[model samples]
Target: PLVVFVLGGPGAGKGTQCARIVEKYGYTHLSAGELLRDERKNPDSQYGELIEKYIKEGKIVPVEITISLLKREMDQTMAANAQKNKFLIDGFPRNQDNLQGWNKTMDGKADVSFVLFFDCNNEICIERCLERGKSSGRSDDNRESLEKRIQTYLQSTKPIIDLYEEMGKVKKIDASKSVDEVFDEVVQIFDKEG
Candidate 1:
């Protein structure tokens, strides 16, 4: 089965493009961000508050919480689908900590099939978040929180893009376009796979 990991800073439009890929390409879009949001509220999770605290402080969620949650979500996705169709995992494996977790879970490693990086300038992303925050009021979307988010992205998540590229499995996409145009670029990846 084809499994593609989509990586991007917040407000980079990963969700908008992933939806299009799902509809047009028959891929199961397993969103890590959405899963993380839910996991933070799961009663079973002891580290939920820790994750929240770090997020509030503009720090990367501890690797343990981040990776455990990804594992939780991946297991659920696998149980339901079991390699049945292509998968597009949005906002996953946030950093090296995540990679270590993946390796441990897979009994060494499961090669990531592809990584798509939605490259956008921080100024634009910040502006987008500022607008989105007022309209949405997400705890994580205000300017101060968003800057922290970007800092975490730069310090931790950016390396994953480089690692995937070195492994020859990364695709860098310019995400400074209308949703439709971004979606079209995502479609081409599936077309090539076909």
Candidate 2:
């Protein structure tokens, strides 16, 4: 079972493209952003307010909290689909801290075999985030947070992607292209990997 880590700048459509991958490959899609958002909305969530604040401020949540949330979801998914543990985990390992958390937590059980890096510039990413913000109703989708998110990605997340590239585990995708065109490349990679 392949465990694909999806990485990209904010608004690079990692979530959007992950849906496509899941649809085509039957992999469970575990979007870290979605999971965090859900956790923030859960009244019983231990760090609901804290996570909300960090997300709204466009700051990465502490790795311990994030990894705990991810592990819970992953445990549930693996149990539900015991026969097939394949996954397309989107919007994670945004920094070395996140990666190390994954290694320390998942480790021998399920390593990230590869990464799908959606490549796009700030112009397109910012525009996409603004448009998505209008309909998504996410607080972090606003201009102030989006700009902070882009800066955070450039400063923190991009280095991890470069590291994966050096390790030959990163698959770069031209995310500025049409959705269909981008998916075509995604299909190629999964097909070859299979």
Candidate 3:
């Protein structure tokens, strides 16, 4: 299967472009945010309450919970689309801990995986996040929360990029450019992968 991991900062326009890519190319779009939202809707689920309380308190969800959720979702998709090879997994493998889940799940089955890194400055990311906060009604969109998110990201996610680079599985794109420009750059990755 062709799995493209679209990774970026919290407000890096990953979703906007992933949706477009999936619509145009027929890649299965596996959005982590959407999965969490779906999980929250099932009030009886064991993790639903945990997610709500942490999100309300502006606490980052534990990496264990996030990875387990992603693994479950990925397994379901794999079972349903066993013959298909294209997948766009977003907001996943957030940290080194989360990244490890791939080993457990894939078990050396797939050889090809591509990562699209959306690099953006902290200031621009923070600015975009405030706008998102206003529209999303999220408690963790203010200065402190944004900083915490970024710090956690740096501590966790940056190394994952390095790992992918070392494995020759990454394609970096500067996220500061215009949306069309960024999309064009990302499209090249699809062309190469496809």
Candidate 4:
């Protein structure tokens, strides 16, 4: 499978853009955060408590747990439709550990096509998150959690983005723009890649 890792700060419109890409390009959109949230809600999940704890603290879950879930989801998606080979992995490889884990676990199973990075101002992101919090119903959607998440992104995720940029595998989109404008840029990138 060809994988495109979607990255951005909290509330940077990663999910929104991913949905547009999926609709236009037929890629499977898999959000790691959403996966963890779902796992945390599962009564039969062994990692439920641990995932919940990490999420509440705005910390990254262990690499093994995240990788396992990603692999499972990828396998299932492939099994369901062998022709579907493109994947937009949102909110993943969040830190060095995640990158290492991915390299070890997914070396030959898939190829990293590129990374789609949404770049936006922190103030705008905070405003967006706070607005979403009114109805997002997510425990980590509040101000305190958003602050910690932004900090984690700065301390951990930004380095990962820089590394990818050095490799010339990151396509940065200005997420401060409206949804249509952002998607327009996204389309241009993907179209050029194709």
Question: Local distance difference test, per candidate?
Answer: 0.73, 0.80, 0.77, 0.85
Tell me the TM-score of model 3: 0.77
Candidate 2 segments whose C-alpha is farther than 4 A from its true place: 45-61, 134-145
Task: lDDT for model 3, please.
Answer: 0.77
Over the stretch 6-104, how does candidate 2's per-residue lDDT look in tens digits?
877877877777888778878888777788788888967877988878889999778778777777777787777776678787667777877877888
Instruction: For model 4, state the Cα shift of residue 168 in Å.
Output: 1.1
In candidate 3, how many Å is residue 114 off?
A: 1.0
Q: For model 3, how big is the CA root-mean-square deviation?
A: 3.9
lDDT of 1 by residue, 1-194 (tens): 45688888887888778788777776778767776777678746666777777778988765566556655655666678786456787666777778767657655324467888887888788888788777764545567788788878877877787787787887778898878777777768667853
Clashing pairs in 4: none
Off by over 4 Å in 4: 45-61, 135-145
RMSD of each: 4.2, 3.8, 3.9, 3.5
| Clash count of each predicted structure | 0, 0, 2, 0
Model 1 stretches astray by more than 4 angstroms: 36-83, 107-111, 137-140
TM-score of each: 0.74, 0.81, 0.77, 0.85
Minimum summed lDDT over a 10-residue window in model 2 is located at 133-142
Displacement of residue 122 (Cα, Å) in model 2 is 1.0
Error of 2 at 88 (Å): 1.5
Number of the top lDDT candidate: 4
